[PDB]
Amino acid sequence: RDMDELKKEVSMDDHKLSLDELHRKYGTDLSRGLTPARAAEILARDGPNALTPPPTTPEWVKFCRQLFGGFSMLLWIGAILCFLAYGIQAATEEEPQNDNLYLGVVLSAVVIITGCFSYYQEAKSSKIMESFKNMVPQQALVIRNGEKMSINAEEVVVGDLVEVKGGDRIPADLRIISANGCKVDNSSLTGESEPQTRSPDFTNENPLETRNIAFFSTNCVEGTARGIVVYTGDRTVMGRIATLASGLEGGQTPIAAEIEHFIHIITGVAVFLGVSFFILSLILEYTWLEAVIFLIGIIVANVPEGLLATVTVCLTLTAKRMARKNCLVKNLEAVETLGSTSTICSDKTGTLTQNRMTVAHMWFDNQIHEADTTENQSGVSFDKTSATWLALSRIAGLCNRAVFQANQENLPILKRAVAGDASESALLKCIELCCGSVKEMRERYTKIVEIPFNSTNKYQLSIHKNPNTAEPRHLLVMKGAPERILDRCSSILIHGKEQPLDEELKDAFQNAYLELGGLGERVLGFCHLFLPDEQFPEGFQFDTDDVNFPLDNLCFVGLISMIDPPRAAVPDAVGKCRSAGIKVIMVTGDHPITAKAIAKGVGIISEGNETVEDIAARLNIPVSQVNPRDAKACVVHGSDLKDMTSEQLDDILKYHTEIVFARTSPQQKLIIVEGCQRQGAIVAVTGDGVNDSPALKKADIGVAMGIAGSDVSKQAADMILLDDNFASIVTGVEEGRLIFDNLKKSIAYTLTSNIPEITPFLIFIIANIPLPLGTVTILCIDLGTDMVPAISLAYEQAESDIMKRQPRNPKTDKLVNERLISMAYGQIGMIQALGGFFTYFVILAENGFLPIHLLGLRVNWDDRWINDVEDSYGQQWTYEQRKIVEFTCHTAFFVSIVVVQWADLVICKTRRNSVFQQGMKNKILIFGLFEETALAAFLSYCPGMGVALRMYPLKPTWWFCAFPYSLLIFVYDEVRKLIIRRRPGGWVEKETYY
Amino acid sequence: MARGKAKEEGSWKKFIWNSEKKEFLGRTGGSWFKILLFYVIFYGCLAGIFIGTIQVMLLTISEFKPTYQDRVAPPGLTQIPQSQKTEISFRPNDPQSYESYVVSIVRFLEKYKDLAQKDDMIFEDCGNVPSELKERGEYNNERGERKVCRFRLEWLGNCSGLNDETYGYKDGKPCVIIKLNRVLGFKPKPPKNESLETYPVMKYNPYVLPVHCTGKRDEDKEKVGTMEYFGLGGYPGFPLQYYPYYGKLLQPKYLQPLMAVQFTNLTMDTEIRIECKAYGENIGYSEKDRFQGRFDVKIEVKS
Amino acid sequence: DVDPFYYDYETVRNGGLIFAALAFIVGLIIILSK
């Protein structure tokens, strides 16, 4: 069941009109297009091809979401019962306290400050992230006035004719005038992503079912089509749908899942204590109203309100950093995932390479030939007149399909802008500069049929009419993977004369590829066949879906190789990447020779490791004789991956340090990825072409080249390097590693405080001593040390070890693990607690009550009526008189925690290095330290603080009581981290490296 | 890689499962031990530091005097009948209704019996009239256990008796007994003619610290009671010869000055609030501490 | 001023408020460092 009935309601089309009819309707010539005039005219009439902006949310409403954001909402709950309990106090007593009045005030205040803070940050992300929504001007290819040009899709009007190819996004609703084996992706419309074919045929009375309508917002997977624009902008079937053509979507990142899991359990225990303490307090003769306020204070205390805001800042930070690096990231959480990468499977052509090729050598007549590679000023280094070169360059031109764009024939050949394969571009530009006009050559040999090139066939092919006299009337021409091409041939062309492909030439063809390909040049094979007349009459009906003509027994003409150098950054890119423990695997549909070469040149493979072929060739023994494990690197032809079991593929992945997968199919690019994932890794695919689509989707993170990348591949990815800068991947990986550390650091720090925030009341019962710390003071601990300092850690700069340490194991280094509970609770949380206890005993003993005396007093110290409370010196204390000291003890215990929280907030700044390497360059941390203590001075030394919150001034000696303990933390962790710097794999590390 | 790590496990039985090696969802007896020990030494030594640093502070307070007194600064006025909620309510005719008030007040006065102040080494005789501060000396172990200024049950007029087992105390019209709070090294100062009292300065400006029990505050109040102060020398307050106090270390059996107030009113069957007040220069009061230098007992002789 | 026994909280209070002022102000001065 669907709603497709509620979509075909408002339809009405011309998928039924004949071509002549279609012509006279829109008025455009079905082959020459519309004049640029008539285009500009209709554009001002109809307005740009762009859906009109759908308002998602308003400002103030987004403010409120933030204000009630998860933790924020519970804060209101407590803040409500704080005002609520204060209302009740003015009904049970005459002029009661001011505690719960001020408590609701502060609590609520926190939600507000937190709220409007987090808002503003999250607003800043959606400012910067949206500054990129309009940086990729989706282009469209239109044939206006005979020639063809690529313009902004916004400039496409009703009427003109569009040409989509493989991986092109369909720019507006089209009626297909023409297509060779075109397949579109109707997923966005009809669910199933299976490629539906578009022919020009009218197939179904319903515009949706029919094959000759290509829709706006779908994209054509592969094949090629020319359509005519029948719906622009909001008028298209996909603009008509008032849902969400572009904006809000789905997916739930692992980092998000880790956080959400933690928050579910931390909030769990935090409410387990609250109510266990709530009933315990009740048992311990706590008043009814101050029991719920004890609970509500406990809950706030074991719940890390900062986390959210911290996360928000961290994203806002990362989104600002990627932005300055021209790296469009569709989901900010995913940058985390890009840190957790163990394995980058990269594409070769247009990714590691510049995709800017230039023809450098040809192989024909058993000889290798050079052609002027840069600043040519001439043509090649052979006679332009050679019969063979003639037959080569004819098909390099004929089987080519690339063309110069509009209004270019007036400037130099290198200076003009093209349209099609970077390979074809080079072929075009080559022969246009040294031989003739491909424009004229192609028009002389009017092309009857073709199967356009695709990443899986790895050859193009076309049958052209021949206008010569030694013309057998039809000329087949084809090009592709030189190996593949050669294997389809019977004869070879030599000095004009074709003569059978003996063994000798085959091996000269093979040294040629080794030679030429070994320079890291890209190679294409070229052959033709002169279709015999008696078998192919004049009006012959060439079929191209059942192959009416020979695909075998062709005449190999030659090889042409083009230079295609590695993109500037790529070496140090993959350098730094491996150095961070990330495994780089090349995955290419190119030839093994060409691949390995680049693999060594960029450093996927290091010259010193051998392949089994390398080893075998060294000892002059059979390759199939070498033991595969003696090889650290290997170059795996996809023709053999076809005969791999998963185990076999698994094993090559498992036991090889430097892998390269050559001549791989699109799917194979997925299998490999699928393999690398099966091992338990997190993979990154960097693509460009549309053959990268399926891997890029399967990958834990897709990364498209923002320029040379296709529509469909950029759409698959989670990252689009707009400057095509491959180095951005490192900048990304570091950033991602940093989100993870700083988010773990924050959780380490915020969790310490819990132990001391709850140990007092636990001991109050276990030793029956005066309460060292109470509700009012617990809140201060929390909202004073566990807030700003926690968020400060988000602003904390990178460590120094990140791009030098192995990628995190997703099933070990969880954002919160047992080792992190070990420290915040069992180690650093304990010490801090002892700091408070110490000062507590010091104050009482100094005020007359030696610790040993303190056992048992609870019942009667808390008792409102016994005013003969005899200390150790025998002195007699009244109720309020000893309470003054008790609550002075509270104010100190709190202040103590503040002192130890410095050291903790210092050690929780670095997880490996020392704090002298790291250095105080996080100014927001320093800021956090000062205000945190200024506040702590203030709460104790401000008048009426003991009448309003039971907080009384400290005597100078008190502050230092916690100092020994604070230092103890700094140094325990300092040496703890030092043992790890100098004992990797060592017991220290394997237990205390949270 | 060839390195074997991670958790590619497929048994939730591993919660306890061990057939392989590791057990209890933990590691092996080698590390289940080793880490247990780490904490053992850690906490063990950690507790050592708390102990240690606690010990350092201990030798910064003399076991003779508190390092701070300003929080017991002015003392408070306290009675001996355990006050339920400051209230002494009973049915005068019925013995059961006050038997609680009696046992508490009787238990305390057993520290003051004549049979308890036997020996002349521990107990010294301060005169039968209130004198000036008998200053034992300097708050040290120099002179040993200082002498205890004795106090006879007889001075508390009419609230002493001499029965058999339990003291025969006041059933018709009760006996409240007032006491001062032991502040180590304190010397009470009786008021002069400037800052006078809510009542005419009963004699003994020199050596008696006055205590006067009026009705509920001083303003418009239902004043219905018959006060009768009983004490040493027949004076309504405290004999200055008992101070200063030298601590539990130096005066283990120190008996403090007592001073009763048998309340023999003319109004049964109702509850009346009565505020006592010890006046002086060394005595302060507080609007929050209802016990600092003063007193708010509300009693009901509802028969 | 002085007299029998007590603790001068006037200066301990004004002293700590001078300090709260330092930490507060210096705290801002770092977070706004030009």
Ligand SMILES: CCCCCCCCCCCCCCCCCC(=O)OC[C@H](COP(=O)([O-])OCC[N+](C)(C)C)OC(=O)CCCCCCCCCCCCCCCCC
């Ligand atoms: C009884 C208990 C009482 C305790 C109450 C404590 C209240 C704390 C409540 C939550 C505070 C959360 C704030 C997160 C930290 C933001 C850091 C940041 O760099 O901000 C700039 C960022 C700007 O973007 P940015 O971070 O990219 O730019 C930073 C550039 N420099 C380095 C120059 C600053 O955002 C803000 O502008 C938002 C404003 C929010 C500030 C909150 C102030 C806290 C108020 C009181 C706390 C105590 C100290 C008193 C001093 C007040 C003056 C500051």
Ligand SMILES: CCCCCCCCCCCCCCCCCC(=O)OC[C@H](COP(=O)([O-])OCC[N+](C)(C)C)OC(=O)CCCCCCCCCCCCCCCCC
């Ligand atoms: C009136 C009430 C009494 C008041 C007193 C209050 C005292 C309570 C103190 C705290 C108790 C809270 C327990 C800790 C919570 C940890 C849960 C967690 O998320 O771990 C999951 C994780 C699960 O991780 P996992 O999901 O990845 O699973 C891993 C396993 N494989 C790989 C096979 C999938 O568990 C652990 O691995 C950790 C083991 C811990 C060892 C023992 C745990 C429990 C023992 C102590 C609790 C005692 C109960 C006290 C209550 C008494 C009430 C009367």
Ligand SMILES: CCCCCCCCCCCCCCCCCC(=O)OC[C@H](COP(=O)([O-])OCC[N+](C)(C)C)OC(=O)CCCCCCCCCCCCCCCCC
């Ligand atoms: C009256 C008694 C008072 C006692 C006070 C005790 C206070 C201690 C509080 C509990 C600490 C646990 C905090 C939970 C935080 C959760 C964080 C999270 O993200 O979880 C994921 C993490 C996941 O980490 P992980 O991924 O590494 O775990 C799985 C990995 N393997 C398979 C290797 C196990 O889970 C945790 O680590 C949970 C911690 C459990 C530790 C056990 C603590 C014991 C509790 C205290 C003593 C019990 C007493 C019993 C006797 C009762 C009699 C009175």
Ligand SMILES: CCCCCCCCCCCCCCCCCC(=O)OC[C@H](COP(=O)([O-])OCC[N+](C)(C)C)OC(=O)CCCCCCCCCCCCCCCCC
């Ligand atoms: C490798 C790195 C190491 C660092 C280099 C070595 C530095 C020198 C070593 C120690 C320094 C001095 C401190 C130790 C003394 C112990 C104090 C004591 O016994 O406490 C109990 C005493 C108790 O003495 P009491 O027994 O008479 O008790 C009564 C005192 N009152 C009434 C005040 C309670 O406590 C104090 O009175 C001390 C508090 C005073 C207030 C301020 C103290 C700050 C001074 C420290 C400065 C450190 C020097 C550096 C300069 C800093 C400039 C920015």
Ligand SMILES: CCCCCCCCCCCCCCCCCC(=O)OC[C@H](COP(=O)([O-])OCC[N+](C)(C)C)OC(=O)CCCCCCCCCCCCCCCCC
């Ligand atoms: C009253 C006591 C006050 C004590 C205050 C002093 C601060 C420190 C207190 C505890 C001692 C622990 C400090 C060790 C930190 C490790 C630094 C390190 O990695 O070095 C290489 C770093 C990094 O060099 P790197 O950048 O070339 O990288 C090398 C990294 N390793 C060598 C680990 C492979 O060098 C430095 O940056 C120099 C700064 C560190 C020097 C320490 C300053 C003072 C600390 C020691 C004084 C205390 C005496 C010791 C006794 C303690 C017991 C009371």
Ligand SMILES: CC(C)CCC[C@@H](C)[C@H]1CC[C@H]2[C@@H]3CC=C4C[C@@H](O)CC[C@]4(C)[C@H]3CC[C@]12C
């Ligand atoms: C209030 C006081 C009494 C609470 C004391 C809680 C102590 C006993 C708790 C707090 C944190 C705990 C540790 C937290 C994490 C781990 C890692 C686990 O693999 C072994 C147990 C161990 C080491 C725990 C032992 C007990 C532990 C140390």
Ligand SMILES: CC(C)CCC[C@@H](C)[C@H]1CC[C@H]2[C@@H]3CC=C4C[C@@H](O)CC[C@]4(C)[C@H]3CC[C@]12C
């Ligand atoms: C290098 C190492 C060993 C130095 C060790 C110094 C320890 C012993 C010092 C550092 C700070 C000290 C404390 C500082 C302040 C006070 C308050 C005072 O009223 C009692 C003593 C007490 C509690 C101190 C005891 C000793 C102390 C803990």
Ligand SMILES: CC(C)CCC[C@@H](C)[C@H]1CC[C@H]2[C@@H]3CC=C4C[C@@H](O)CC[C@]4(C)[C@H]3CC[C@]12C
């Ligand atoms: C190394 C760094 C972290 C040490 C920080 C030392 C800070 C904690 C110390 C140094 C001097 C201290 C002050 C010294 C004297 C007084 C007067 C007293 O009436 C109030 C506290 C107050 C104001 C103290 C607060 C804390 C204090 C400011």
Ligand SMILES: Nc1ncnc2c1ncn2[C@@H]1O[C@H](COP(=O)(O)OP(=O)(O)O)[C@@H](O)[C@H]1O
């Ligand atoms: N336009 C084209 N016409 C014919 N053959 C081509 C064309 N482009 C590439 N080829 C050949 O087919 C192979 C497959 O290319 P593909 O599968 O996309 O990988 P890559 O883009 O890395 O070459 C190429 O190595 C090349 O030899």
Ligand code: ALF
């Ligand atoms: F650029 Al490729 F296969 F290397 F598409």
Ligand SMILES: [Mg+2]
């Ligand atoms: Mg590609």
Ligand SMILES: [Mg+2]
């Ligand atoms: Mg390609």
Ligand code: NA
């Ligand atoms: Na909290």
Ligand code: NA
């Ligand atoms: Na994915």
Ligand code: NA
């Ligand atoms: Na903390």
Ligand code: NA
């Ligand atoms: Na906390």
